[PDB]
Amino acid sequence: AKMYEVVRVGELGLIGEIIRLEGDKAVIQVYEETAGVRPGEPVVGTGASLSVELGPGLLTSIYDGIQRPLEVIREKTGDFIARGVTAPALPRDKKWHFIPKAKVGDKVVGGDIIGEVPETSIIVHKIMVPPGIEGEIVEIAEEGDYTIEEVIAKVKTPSGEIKELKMYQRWPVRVKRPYKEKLPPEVPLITGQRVIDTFFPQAKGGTAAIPGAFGSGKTVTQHQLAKWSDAQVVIYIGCGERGNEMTDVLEEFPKLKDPKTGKPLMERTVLIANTSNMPVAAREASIYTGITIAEYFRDMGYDVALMADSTSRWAEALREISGRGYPAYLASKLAEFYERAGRVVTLGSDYRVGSVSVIGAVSPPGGDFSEPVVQNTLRVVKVFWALDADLARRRHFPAINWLTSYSLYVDAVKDWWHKNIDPEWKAMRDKAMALLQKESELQEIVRIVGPDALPERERAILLVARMLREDYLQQDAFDEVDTYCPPEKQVTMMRVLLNFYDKTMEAINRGVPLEEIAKLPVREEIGRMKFERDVSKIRSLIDKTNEQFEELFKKYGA
């Protein structure tokens, strides 16, 4: 009997005589397991690999799990149903402006950039020698307009073999794109969101997760990350977790502006879509397709952000087996996916660095986690931003719980902050975090015994922790200034707050009543500094704080 592990649509897991797992569209099957063409049930093998096309055409595109383009059908009750159609990944009709960057006689290796194509108004697409090709450029195209199938260069290998190069290349999605070296985490992916960059930093090339649960301001946070992180290119996977998602992706996504250029965000984005309507095999393949495309852009020397929010549609690619699916293996590959994240010295003759940072949504079963998509080789994820519904209901925005979130990149990125931005960055965050932890402990004790017997010193810690939460952790994504917080602004707002802490504890020491400090006028300016775009005006709050505390030391014995 045929196990019909999929409905006859767009891909299936084929298990052969002696070799397990391959895939097709019609009945002709591209294969991971090498095979000997013509097993049981009329199945004929092919060239080989499940692969993607990489060249001009990727940007602004929407694909399914195996890089076949759109085709949509109209309304319903979800109202936009989409499916992957057998057509070409990169348009064969369009003319691209090719600019040569190499010349006849140049020696080249894989990764070398031999030309450039302005693909969109945002991104210059770098044309690269495919991995494993090297030798002498014996022929190269003149500046001009060409379709993707046109040969733009010829390379003679050391054998004398002549290789024909196009503006695009193919790569098997299940094989990591090669590079020279994976560099240790070091440079932060700057999100411009205070709580993240300060307390739970992402490294360029790092791995982060958020809860996939709707609400808590997830789509706001995902939108903020996609548009503000200092990655040049975004690869987004999902689009199918709710009924209306595809609808919003077709109507609204072309409207979104890259705030850094004023141009459409789609002009540095590639979308991969996973839906209930699509074959279970394509959705399994989707993450590999996405990360291969991400790697391909890092190879050019770009920082890229691979963002996935498709847990339920991806996870429901769960399937029946009989024979042996695979116990200590179902999370071993998810590991190999996350393992493909990294900042690397890329292939090429020039020293060149690119990265893929991964931000993935994680949804166990519903609310509380157990074992589903949670805690196998968990330490594969180094950052967790714990979007928290309770915080959302208290209207604390970005609803990131600062007690259950973590980052293992704090020490990895501190040196970049110390030498480029502020020598005290790490000392200041640790100090602020200790205050938040103390506040939490105090709030729990108070819950029990009441707030009435609180000494001044503890009331002061509570006052300043509250200022940290309101003036620093809370950030307004909808505000034209506070939508992004530059690194220099982040450290300056922190110094203002921590200097206010220092002066508060000092004042209390010299017998200044806390009610006097709570009403210090500068406090309300500290409450609004996130809205101030001029960082020098924010810095001037340090002296203004100092001065006002002086007038307090005067109104008292000091």
Swiss-Prot record:
Keywords: ATP synthesis, ATP-binding, Autocatalytic cleavage, Cell membrane, Endonuclease, Hydrogen ion transport, Hydrolase, Intron homing, Ion transport, Membrane, Nuclease, Nucleotide-binding, Protein splicing, Translocase, Transport. One of its GO terms (biological process) is proton motive force-driven plasma membrane ATP synthesis. It comes from the Archaea. Belongs to the ATPase alpha/beta chains family. It is found in: Cell membrane. PROSITE patterns: ATPASE_ALPHA_BETA, INTEIN_C_TER, INTEIN_ENDONUCLEASE, INTEIN_N_TER. The intein interrupts the ATP-binding site. One of its GO terms (molecular function) is endonuclease activity. Component of the A-type ATP synthase that produces ATP from ADP in the presence of a proton gradient across the membrane. The A chain is the catalytic subunit. The lineage of its organism: Archaea, Methanobacteriati, Methanobacteriota, Thermococci, Thermococcales. It catalyses: ATP + H2O + 4 H(+)(in) = ADP + phosphate + 5 H(+)(out). This protein undergoes a protein self splicing that involves a post-translational excision of the VDE intervening region (intein) followed by peptide ligation. This is A-type ATP synthase subunit A. It is a peripheral membrane protein. Has multiple subunits with at least A(3), B(3), C, D, E, F, H, I and proteolipid K(x).
